From Swiss-Prot:
The record marks D238 as: Important for catalytic activity. The record marks N167 as: Transition state stabilizer. This is DNA repair nuclease/redox regulator APEX1. Induction: Up-regulated in presence of reactive oxygen species (ROS), like bleomycin, H(2)O(2) and phenazine methosulfate. Its EC number is 3.1.11.2, 3.1.21.-. Changing C163A: Does not abolish the redox activity. Gene3D superfamilies: Endonuclease/exonuclease/phosphatase. Changing C265A: Does not abolish the redox activity. It comes from Homo sapiens (Human). The modification Phosphoserine is found at S12. The N-terminus contains the redox activity while the C-terminus exerts the DNA AP-endodeoxyribonuclease activity; both functions are independent in their actions. An unconventional mitochondrial targeting sequence (MTS) is harbored within the C-terminus, that appears to be masked by the N-terminal sequence containing the nuclear localization signal (NLS), that probably blocks the interaction between the MTS and Tom proteins. NPM1 stimulates endodeoxyribonuclease activity on double-stranded DNA with AP sites, but inhibits endoribonuclease activity on single-stranded RNA containing AP sites. Changing D238A: Strongly reduces AP endodeoxyribonuclease activity, but does not affect RNA cleavage activity. Nearly abolishes AP endodeoxyribonuclease activity. Mg(2+) 2 binds at D165, N167, H264.
Length: 273
């Protein structure tokens, strides 16, 4: 029914110790999440890189409590220009990245930050949700294709880490209501197969499902309504996708189901790099 996350495995299969803690989190409103003690939690988790989705906040209004994070001093923020209080992503890092990109060619959306580091390439994404009653599904389908082709061009260089709200639960084990949902945004057969296409084209592996293939009831999102988080009626929408190149460095990929602050919970990735 409910889930208790395994302990942090901080050594790789080869016996090497992890040297890179990456944490992603859909804050569903960066200003609210901050007031609900999110920064205090990030400080305790002490990641080398923090990725944030659905900031819903222009760079104008970015709270200066963020400047109070010196272990994540290098901060980059993407924001849609048309609609305020919509979408937005952010990347905070201990080290400065070498190259910093935004979007995937077709630009205005504030969904994708791409950061090249010394050994790898990190992408954060707040993938468009199909919408209640599938109003945006046919857009998400073109998004899935675009994201894929853009990403396969980046994996021609360094290995890839892709994290963020991917707004799709892959298999039935990834949600608690598989059968009452396959006509609802996040578990339709188009979205489900587009995520497999993603794993195939680039290619990539689901870090968490690699190490925990049978583990059910492990969700990263619960609707606010109907005390669903109390009942672990949730979904796994937040992912750490890894280049195959990188799996021998994969120490562990976590779900921080107990950190409050948003409708989504944090995830954390360890790489022995």
């Amino acid at each position: 029914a409910l889930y208790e996350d395994p302990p942090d495995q901080k050594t790789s299969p080869s016996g090497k110790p992890a040297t890179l803690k990456i944490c992603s989190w859909n804050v569903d409103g960066l200003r609210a999440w901050i007031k609900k003690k999110g920064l205090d939690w990030v400080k305790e988790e002490a990641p080398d890189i923090l990725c944030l989705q659905e900031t819903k906040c222009s760079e104008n209004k970015l709270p200066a409590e963020l400047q109070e994070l010196p272990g994540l001093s290098h901060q980059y923020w993407s924001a849609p220009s048309d609609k305020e209080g919509y979408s937005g992503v952010g990347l905070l890092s201990r080290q400065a990245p070498l190259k910093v990109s935004y979007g995937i060619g077709d630009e205005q959306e504030g969904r994708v930050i791409v950061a090249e580091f010394d050994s790898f390439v990190l992408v954060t994404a707040y993938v468009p949700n199909a919408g209640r009653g599938l109003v945006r599904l046919e857009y998400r389908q073109r998004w899935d294709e675009a994201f894929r082709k853009f990403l396969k061009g980046l994996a021609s260089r360094k290995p890839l880490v892709l994290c963020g709200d991917l707004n799709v639960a892959h298999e039935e084990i990834d949600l608690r209501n598989p059968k009452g949902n396959k006509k609802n945004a996040g578990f339709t057969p188009q979205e489900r197969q587009g995520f497999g296409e993603l794993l195939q084209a680039v290619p990539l592996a689901d870090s968490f499902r690699h190490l925990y293939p049978n583990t059910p009831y492990a969700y990263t999102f619960w609707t606010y309504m109907m005390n669903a988080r109390s009942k672990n009626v949730g979904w796994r929408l937040d992912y750490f996708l890894l280049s195959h190149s990188l799996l021998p460095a994969l120490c562990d990929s976590k779900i921080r189901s107990k950190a409050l602050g948003s409708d989504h919970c944090p995830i954390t990735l360890y790489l022995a790099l």
